[PDB]
C-alpha cells in the first residue's frame with residue numbers, strides 16, 4: 184500500500200501470536216517493542232535515540248507479520264514508549280520512501 | 283526518487299546557505315537539527331524520544347531545501363544526535379511510504 188505521513192504511520196503487527204500496533208520508522212536502525220515475553224536466549228544491548236540510551240534485551244531470528252507480510256530478524260525488547268519497526272525489518276517487506 | 287532502507291535514508295539539505303546531512307525520519311513528528319544559528323525569536327519546546335526528553339528551541343517559517351525540494355516550516359534546534367527531517371516537512375515534499 185501507499186502510506187501518507189499526515190499522521191503517524193501506525194500499522195498492525197503480529198508477533199508471538201499477539202496483535203500489536205507499531206510505528207513504521209525509517210529513522211530507526213533497529214526494531215524495538217514494549218516489554219513482552221519471547222522464546223529463546225537473549226543478549227543485553229544499549230540503544231540510543233533522542234534523549235539518550237536505554238537497556239534492551241536482544242532476540243534473534245524472530246518472526247513478525249507486518250500488514251500481512253512475513254519478515255524475520257532481530258527484535259529488541261525494552262522500556263520503549265511505542266513499538267517501533269526499524270529498517271532491519273522494513274527492508275524485508277520491501278518498504279521504500281518515495282517523493 | 284525512491285529510497286530503499288538497506289542504509290540510513292540520509293539526504294543533503296540546505297539551510298541558511300549551508301549544506302548539511304539529515305535523516306528522512308517517518309518516526310519523528312518534528313524536524314530537529316543540531317545546534318546552529320537561525321534568525322528571529324524562538325519559543326521553548328520539550329520533545330521526547332527513545333531515551334527521554336530534551337529541550338529545544340523552536341523557530342517558525344524557516345526555509346529549508348530537502349533534496350532540491352524547497353519547504354518552509356517549523357524547525358527545532360537542540361542537542362539531537364543527528365539532523366532529523368520529520369513528518370512536518372516530509373509531507374511538504376510529498377514523501378510517502380510504499381510496499
Ligand SMILES: CC[C@H](C)[C@H](NC(=O)[C@H](OCc1ccccc1)[C@H](O)[C@@H](O)[C@@H](OCc1ccccc1)C(=O)N[C@H](C(=O)NC)[C@@H](C)CC)C(=O)NC
Pocket residue numbers: 206208209210211212213214215230231232233264265267269305307308309310311312313314329330331332363364366368
Ligand atoms: C528505535 C530507536 C533507534 C535505536 C534509534 N533511532 C531513533 O531514535 C530515531 O531518531 C533518529 C536518530 C537516529 C540515530 C541516532 C539517534 C536518533 C527515531 O525515528 C526517533 O526520531 C523517534 O523514535 C520513535 C518514537 C516515536 C514516538 C515516541 C517515542 C519514540 C522519535 O524519537 N520521535 C520523536 C517523536 O515523534 N516523539 C513524539 C521526535 C520528536 C524526535 C525528533 C537509532 O537508530 N539509533 C542508532
